[PDB]
Amino acid sequence: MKLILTADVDHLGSIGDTVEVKDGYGRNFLLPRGLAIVASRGAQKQA
RNA sequence: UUGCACUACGAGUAAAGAUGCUCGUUACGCGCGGCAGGACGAAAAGACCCCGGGACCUUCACUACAACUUGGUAUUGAUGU
Ligand SMILES: [Mg+2]
Ligand SMILES: [Mg+2]
Ligand SMILES: [Mg+2]
Ligand SMILES: [Mg+2]
Ligand SMILES: [Mg+2]
Ligand SMILES: [Mg+2]
Ligand SMILES: [Mg+2]
Ligand SMILES: [Mg+2]
Ligand SMILES: [Mg+2]
Ligand SMILES: [Mg+2]
Ligand SMILES: [Mg+2]
Numbered sequence: 001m002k003l004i005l006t007a008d009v010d011h012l013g014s015i016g017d018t019v020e021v022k023d024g025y026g027r028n029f030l031l032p033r034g035l036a037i038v039a040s041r042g043a044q045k046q047a
Numbered sequence: 048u049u050g051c052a053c054u055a056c057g058a059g060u061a062a063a064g065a066u067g068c069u070c071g072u073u074a075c076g077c078g079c080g081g082c083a084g085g086a087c088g089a090a091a092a093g094a095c096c097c098c099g100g101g102a103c104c105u106u107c108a109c110u111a112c113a114a115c116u117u118g119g120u121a122u123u124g125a126u127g128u
Contacts, residue, residue, distance in 0.1 A: 024124045
C-alpha cells in the first residue's frame, strides 16, 4: 500500500507527497500517529 | 449329581487299567450304621505342554504420533555501521 504523508517524516518525505513503506512501519507508526493516510481518494484533493 | 440298571470277583480281552465282553468262580431278597479301594468318583470346556487368537510389558523390531527442539516465512518496524 501507498501512504500520502500529511506530516513531515525525516528521510521519508515532506507534506503531501506519496511514499511507499514496508507495511509494518505504516500501520504501526504512521497511521496511528496521524503522520500518513492511505492513498485512495486524496490525490484529487491534493491536485 | 444323574445315558441307562435286578450295577460281583478272578484271570483274560478290548481305545493297551472292564459292574456291563470271554471263560470260570462266587453270590438268597431288602434295609440300617460305618469305611473310603474303584466307579479313570463330583467340581471348574487343564492353569502345565503344544497349536490358533488376544492382552499387557520391553527394546539399538517396524511404522507412526505427542512432547521437546532447528531453521525459513508471516505477525515484523526505524536508523546507522
Ligand atoms: Mg508484510
Ligand atoms: Mg450284590
Ligand atoms: Mg478285570
Ligand atoms: Mg468279568
Ligand atoms: Mg450283558
Ligand atoms: Mg451303606
Ligand atoms: Mg479317587
Ligand atoms: Mg473327575
Ligand atoms: Mg479345553
Ligand atoms: Mg533411545
Ligand atoms: Mg521456531
